[PDB]
Amino acid sequence: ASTVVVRDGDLSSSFLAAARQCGRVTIDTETTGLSPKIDGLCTVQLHVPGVGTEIVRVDPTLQPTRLLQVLAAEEIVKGFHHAVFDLGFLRHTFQSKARSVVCSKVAAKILWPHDKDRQSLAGLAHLLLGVVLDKTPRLSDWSQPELTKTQVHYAAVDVEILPPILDELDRLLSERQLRELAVACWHHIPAHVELLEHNLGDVFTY
Amino acid sequence: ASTVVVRDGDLSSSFLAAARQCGRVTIDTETTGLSPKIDGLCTVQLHVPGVGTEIVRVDPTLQPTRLLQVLAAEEIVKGFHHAVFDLGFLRHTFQSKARSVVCSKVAAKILWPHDKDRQSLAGLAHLLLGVVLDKTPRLSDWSQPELTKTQVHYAAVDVEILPPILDELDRLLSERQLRELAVACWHHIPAHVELLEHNLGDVFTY
Ligand SMILES: [Cl-]
Ligand SMILES: [Cl-]
After folding, report:
1. How far, in Å, is the centroid of ligand 2 from the Cα of B177?
2. Cα torsion B192, B196, B200, B206: sign
3. Which of these, A5, A13, A204, B9, could form a disulfide with B59 (CB 3.0-4.6 Å)?
4. What domain range includes position B8?
5. Does residue B170 sit within a domain?
């Protein structure tokens, strides 16, 4: 959490430029609960490697125009942990339909299908980076008029830790010849979000 | 079942040409049971609209080279009913990895998520075409040294009925603005087959 600014309503015009120069960003959100179609989206965090992190506080009366630009941009890769969760909120709240998203949880489920510990952000961070993540601020009040120092730091860490985690999952995927499958699965995340948004369920079974 | 030929081991060179001229074919299979990774693949049926239908009897000692060419060909659309099932057999038996496949079951699950009747080939044929399909030969012995007249006719009908069914689902999908979602889902079928082949399960949940 080297350099973090809390923004109201939208990503700043400076980070939009930095995201476009970089071609790659990481994204996370804080909410009032676990149901992307019922609970409230409170903040969206965006990190530009080398530049810093913005915490965007959602306004009900404002589309976060420049944030939706980044999400939709084919030429900007957006890394998440559990992209289906975060994009479900973004889709239900803002009608956002993202392109070029990747997900460390999907990656982890391909590499370690039977191990829930390695499928969590904290499991990935400890295994790959030697880093212990503090998870206690996740249940705090993200709609509070002023985010605390602890909140800001927590919200920043969970986007700033994704670039090294994602790079390391890429290498493990390539080694086991599963990267093309992870690539195909990441490419399906936005469609999977639409299926959930429309209550269409599992279209691939009998 | 206007014009049907039973082929040993592979699709004929003439249908490979006709599939390439047409740019579109429909596909179905007959098997010894419902588990694509355990049960035997007995036949693969391929229909070229306007030309006819081949029933390919699988040989254990022979890759059906020209059939695998059609399956892999990006420029040839392959229509199935329940593509995940058929491609699971083709993937486990021949290591076949298909491109540009579409599926009437996936389409039906998007249009009618809660109605199992409309998600079956016979439900689709009756609703859309007014056609009653005889399903009794499905449990017959497809590894028998000579397929019966009833078997040949059954195996041919279930590929020849797919082109009108698929064209009609396209129109219903477009009308409700769900065709882009069906297109995205069809594009994911081969990856979903790989996930099942590797026992990776649902990579898109928590
Ligand atoms: Cl604040
Ligand atoms: Cl025969």
Report:
1. 44
2. positive
3. B9
4. 4-197
5. yes
